[PDB]
């Protein structure tokens, strides 16, 4: 990853995230639980779908026979054909090796940016009410139940409500 | 302390792919881009197919017994077969592959009578080599020879002007007899010169006895243009001329026809059906095909890095 | 898309921003005010021209005739020329597509990058005097008049001079 | 509280372009990369053209009436025309296309005499197929024939050493009479034999009486090297050989010439003027050209993503 | 320069950091000092070696002579061959141009990334105990001797250990 | 006030590379991908070379004196020199180039007797151009003529069945005499003809007397298949036939061999040794070669953006 989230500061993936691609795992007094952000999963799937749209269902141009495997042709022309054919294959094999290699690179990093973005939002959403732990967690400084953790995922977290309270906790 | 943690998903069974910097890096899910699944059948559904079988393509022009079926064939997909031959009486078309390629895209042929009539000679020249319940000849040709052995051949001129709106395929032939006596026996004595002239083609022919053959020659004659023939023996006359119907694709294969599968990309070992942009099945394809590559497989990532715990 | 700023955490552009590519919009005691930025605007067009200088005005190779239009050549040879030629078209139509599609993706992501790069230059410069919306605004916790706003714009803003004041406003 | 906000420009006038991820995303500004704007003219400014018109290219070697002002020409842009003809009297060149291809890059031709003087024979064989003031012949050629009707043509040798620094294009012809009777009239009676022998080229010719035609054959004779002509009739001998000037580009077209536009990319129906990398105008071009693609449009972004207010 | 670290906020590179690729430079009460980073140098180099493997030492294509350079072959087929060869040259000169120009665009930005990643690693380590100065340095709000500096470089720095002092240096107001 | 900083390395003066958006941007380290250093020798180490010296490649099949020591050979690397000649006596091969193209990948050749025994003709025809220690004509050929001057040469049929594992290379020659008279002196009067027939191949040849020459022809006989020669004169008959060994590369070069450098890529001017993807040395190469590009140098960044202090 170029953004340093997937296989970066985030230790690993979650083998129990069936809901989507990226999620929220919260810990509180109520207990542990896991959700999944639709917006950032969908944003990432279309960019992969769009990649396959350009590569699949391509209309190809017609090509006719230039040689003859039953009654063989004048070997001057014949060999010229073979020679050309061989070069054509080499160009395409090179391009296929490169297209995929190049596209896969962009795919991996694109999924990583998505991780980075979602993290970025939550960071800015939480303002001065939480501190990042460095492995992808936010230590919320005010007591925050299942309804409260909801407001973060649902992206409707009024930070003012918990500021004075979680600030006092940040000094002690 | 209450915490909210962000993170991505992973599977137990990732797939290996390649990038610009990593080779063999593992992703959540991947997709193959190289087709390797072949249908061992020529997929003709939708098409009007022609399985020439025993009949060679150039054969449909002259009409040996093998091609009686396809003298005026009509298709948009022409399947040649290995056992197919163009002639029965020994002899070879000149610039034959050029003609083959033209016939492969022709849409089939429609034969039209050239309207030649001859007296002073015999036009019924048949041979045992080409039997059709007794000796016969190529069904679109006439073997012109003297009324009796050693009788002189009259200097003849025959002209055909193309009344159609599309070019006309004109085939004629130069029969080379066996001995010098053979040639004198069927035609005159002396030099037998054939002259064929159109407004963009002039060519002459001399028979070479010593080994018997009918070598066939062709020209494409434009609308409202004339072909003139001037000869005095050894000449094999066209009865009918051919016109191309429209468009077609020519395939060479040993694969059977199947009218239940549909496809548009063909090769000698069957039909390639695929949306995929590349294929490793066969490099020598006809039709609308995926680009051929050397790799058995090239997986395209459709998911992030797989990082299991 | 990659950087998350343009069509990401920043809502939309400004059709009123005619003076340049990227810029600042301050609100305070003395009305509105919009002003472009040079370095980052300049930097971005330095790059876009670079792409153009690599595509426009190339020296092409010379190619002679191999066909004959008026006197049809031997179909064997012509069909070989026609194959090769169409095969070449396929390789270039591919390249063209993929080059233009590839270069374009890079243009989109580079432009989103210049926005982010600038946004971060500012974030750092303000230190603890301002917080973040997450919509691309910095809530400044002291009185910054129009002549103060410009210090921020061209990197002369001294955060120490407003720090003590700012910190108490964040309480 | 006071605040400073960050942003980027926008428009309503945004162009839809294609990326690896999405077809039809909107950017601030774009710029077409495929050229579709054709000039219906051949662009001859800064160059030195030679429009051949009724004169077929290879006509510049032998000199039928159509090609009289093009016998020696200097050019870096040779333009063939649909109407151009190589001949006046029925006949054809050997490896004509090969010759055409080497003539197109010649830089034009310069003509020099070969020092051929004949006696004991006639030199002035004309035909009605080539008219200047009535019966005429090929201007750079001599039709040699017997002193009277049925008179015997003498056995002869003709040598010519290339004096120059570059190779020489020697063209000779063979005359094929209407009949044996006619050949016996023009030259002697009996076997007629022509041998053209350079240090790198041997090739016997015998005339074949049957249809009136004159076939032209050719070689490149190297500096210091000698070509030798041994013949006894039916020989259309050269009066003048030809040397190439430098480098030129050959074009085939129907577009008129224009000396007020500059360009290096020419085709069937004009000239491509562009700094763009690709063009969608014609798959068949000559000179220094952008690459033909099949897309009408491939738009390159020259601005950021557009998100209007 | 996508990640804005190299040729962005980090004014310049250090001509005297031959120990490695990306590094640290401390300034404490005990003087000045430079040390390099193994984790992030190696991450970059492995991704650059990766690119060389991809292009250097790749299996070449089989080549055969179609022309004749001693006794020239017939003109017409010679031009078709020449034309075809020159198309290949145009194609491969295009690809190489672009391959390299793209690998070089990715190399520079990939390098920038590793600098930015390490920077963000250190930023998170220090937590509330330091501030960013905008030039790539951290103003550390507590005493940090050589051992302390060491712990940061090798990721064992314990922010909770120094937090209490740092806050007494950052918030220079009453609460 | 303690502080820790983050930074990267730099050198005094790095190297300039090109990117997508900038030209000549300095980076810490870069490496070359285009090979321009040529080794001016044929690097034969590991291979078994065959420097054909004065023997032309095609000589090896018919056997002029310059090829006595190459009538049979084994090689994975054949090196043609400019001074090689295939003939001893005027005349060309037909298809000379494809025959070279086939021989250049043969892996060498081995000769076998066809076992033609001849009755009632003269076998020992000789030329002084070919005379040597061994025999007075091409080593692998027999010049067949009449028992005496002007005597009639009988109509004759000879056949050869390939008894082997792999296809045979069958060479025959056609003799064109100096004159009609001279053709009569060697083979008798009358029109002459040569026909050659396998199950793939069928071709008629007539001598064209006028300028002394021997033109050679060839085919590839399928294993188990028979070839047939029918002829009444002017026929140059094969004594032996060649069989290809394995796999070779064929180089045309004027550079000396060197048996102490490993080579895989070859060209007219020596050897390219390089694991580089591209080369600017020579566009016409043979073997496992870097692709030819028209650029001198393409620098690839092995390091980061260099920013001096
Ligand atoms: C006369 C005709 O139209 N067809 C003949 C055929 C031809 O005359 C011949 O192929 C032309 O060269 O010959 C047929 O021949 C009988 C006979 O001919 C002798 O010359 C030959 O030596 C014999 O072997 C024998 O073939 C034939 O074989 O088909 C008869 C046919 O009607
Ligand atoms: C005698 C000569 O050098 N040229 C003749 C020319 C040739 O002999 C002939 O073209 C070679 O095949 O014939 C020309 O004449 C007019 C006349 O020719 C008769 O032979 C023919 O029978 C008539 O129909 C008529 O065309 C000619 O003009 O080409 C005369 C020329 O002098
Ligand atoms: C008879 C035979 O098999 N070979 C002759 C040879 C042939 O007659 C000739 O190559 C057929 O084209 O001619 C040779 O002899 C010397 C002699 O030949 C004259 O034809 C020529 O004018 C002179 O060079 C003269 O010396 C020959 O070797 O070329 C003799 C050989 O026996
Ligand atoms: C050009 O290549 C083709 C295919 O590689 C060659 O044909 C093959 O080789 C032999 C015939 O010599 C057959 O056993 C194969 O079945 C052929 N394969 C196909 C697909 O046709 C062909 O011989 C080569 N041409 C020349 C002139 O060497
Ligand atoms: C992982 O990818 C595979 C193939 O890339 C997907 O398999 C396809 O699944 C659909 C059903 O959803 C089938 O109809 C197709 O036939 C499959 N395609 C192919 C090419 O085999 C699969 O859906 C993906 N897995 C998950 C969990 O999304
Ligand atoms: C190869 O393709 C060219 C197209 O450039 C063909 O030439 C065209 O022929 C068609 C009819 O067959 C006409 O519609 C066009 O007017 C022709 N165009 C030109 C520029 O000549 C040509 O026929 C093809 N060659 C072969 C051997 O099939
Ligand atoms: C095909 O291209 C090559 C040039 O790359 C021609 O070959 C040479 O051309 C040079 C011109 O400077 C001359 O020295 C020789 O004529 C050739 N020598 C060698 C070693 O290749 C070739 O002539 C071209 N083919 C045609 C038909 O023009
Ligand atoms: C934007 O693109 C248009 C159309 O290609 C062009 O006229 C103009 O030069 C470009 N630049 C600006 C700044 O408008
Ligand atoms: C840089 O790359 C080159 C390869 O061209 C190599 O020889 C050199 O040792 C590398 N490293 C340095 C530090 O120069």
mmCIF file of C-alpha atoms and ligand atoms in Angstrom, chain C residues 64, chain D residues 101-102 105, chain E residues 67-70 72-83 85-86, chain F residues 82 268 283-284, ligand 7:
data_model
loop_
_atom_site.group_PDB
_atom_site.id
_atom_site.type_symbol
_atom_site.label_atom_id
_atom_site.label_comp_id
_atom_site.label_asym_id
_atom_site.label_seq_id
_atom_site.Cartn_x
_atom_site.Cartn_y
_atom_site.Cartn_z
ATOM 1 C CA UNK C 64 6.621 4.484 -48.002
ATOM 2 C CA UNK D 101 8.549 1.261 -55.628
ATOM 3 C CA UNK D 102 12.164 2.061 -56.468
ATOM 4 C CA UNK D 105 11.996 7.100 -53.810
ATOM 5 C CA UNK E 67 16.010 -10.187 -44.904
ATOM 6 C CA UNK E 68 19.188 -10.877 -46.859
ATOM 7 C CA UNK E 69 22.037 -8.408 -46.486
ATOM 8 C CA UNK E 70 24.454 -9.915 -49.003
ATOM 9 C CA UNK E 72 19.286 -8.462 -51.930
ATOM 10 C CA UNK E 73 15.869 -10.134 -52.139
ATOM 11 C CA UNK E 74 13.091 -9.114 -54.569
ATOM 12 C CA UNK E 75 12.169 -5.433 -54.121
ATOM 13 C CA UNK E 76 8.430 -5.763 -53.372
ATOM 14 C CA UNK E 77 8.660 -8.253 -50.541
ATOM 15 C CA UNK E 78 11.697 -6.294 -49.291
ATOM 16 C CA UNK E 79 9.559 -3.172 -48.782
ATOM 17 C CA UNK E 80 6.757 -5.101 -47.014
ATOM 18 C CA UNK E 81 9.387 -6.567 -44.658
ATOM 19 C CA UNK E 82 11.005 -3.164 -44.202
ATOM 20 C CA UNK E 83 7.608 -1.580 -43.539
ATOM 21 C CA UNK E 85 10.101 -3.977 -39.220
ATOM 22 C CA UNK E 86 9.708 -0.196 -39.007
ATOM 23 C CA UNK F 82 29.817 -12.040 -47.823
ATOM 24 C CA UNK F 268 25.791 -8.461 -38.970
ATOM 25 C CA UNK F 283 17.430 -3.789 -35.979
ATOM 26 C CA UNK F 284 18.251 -7.001 -37.893
HETATM 27 C C1 LIG G 7 15.295 -2.234 -46.416
HETATM 28 O O1 LIG G 7 16.035 -1.434 -45.505
HETATM 29 C C2 LIG G 7 17.455 -1.523 -45.508
HETATM 30 C C3 LIG G 7 18.010 -0.313 -44.755
HETATM 31 O O2 LIG G 7 17.755 -0.450 -43.377
HETATM 32 C C4 LIG G 7 18.108 -1.612 -46.898
HETATM 33 O O3 LIG G 7 19.323 -2.326 -46.771
HETATM 34 C C5 LIG G 7 20.506 -1.502 -46.935
HETATM 35 O O4 LIG G 7 20.318 -0.163 -47.372
HETATM 36 C C6 LIG G 7 21.526 0.580 -47.355
HETATM 37 C C7 LIG G 7 21.200 2.058 -47.590
HETATM 38 O O5 LIG G 7 22.160 2.865 -46.912
HETATM 39 C C8 LIG G 7 22.500 0.037 -48.415
HETATM 40 O O6 LIG G 7 23.826 0.047 -47.930
HETATM 41 C C9 LIG G 7 22.160 -1.377 -48.899
HETATM 42 O O7 LIG G 7 21.340 -1.275 -50.045
HETATM 43 C C10 LIG G 7 21.483 -2.266 -47.836
HETATM 44 N N1 LIG G 7 22.468 -2.958 -47.007
HETATM 45 C C11 LIG G 7 22.200 -3.736 -45.942
HETATM 46 C C12 LIG G 7 23.394 -4.337 -45.257
HETATM 47 O O8 LIG G 7 21.072 -3.979 -45.501
HETATM 48 C C13 LIG G 7 17.255 -2.298 -47.973
HETATM 49 O O9 LIG G 7 17.717 -1.911 -49.252
HETATM 50 C C14 LIG G 7 15.772 -1.964 -47.845
HETATM 51 N N2 LIG G 7 15.013 -2.683 -48.863
HETATM 52 C C15 LIG G 7 14.552 -2.094 -49.981
HETATM 53 C C16 LIG G 7 13.796 -2.963 -50.944
HETATM 54 O O10 LIG G 7 14.713 -0.900 -50.245
#
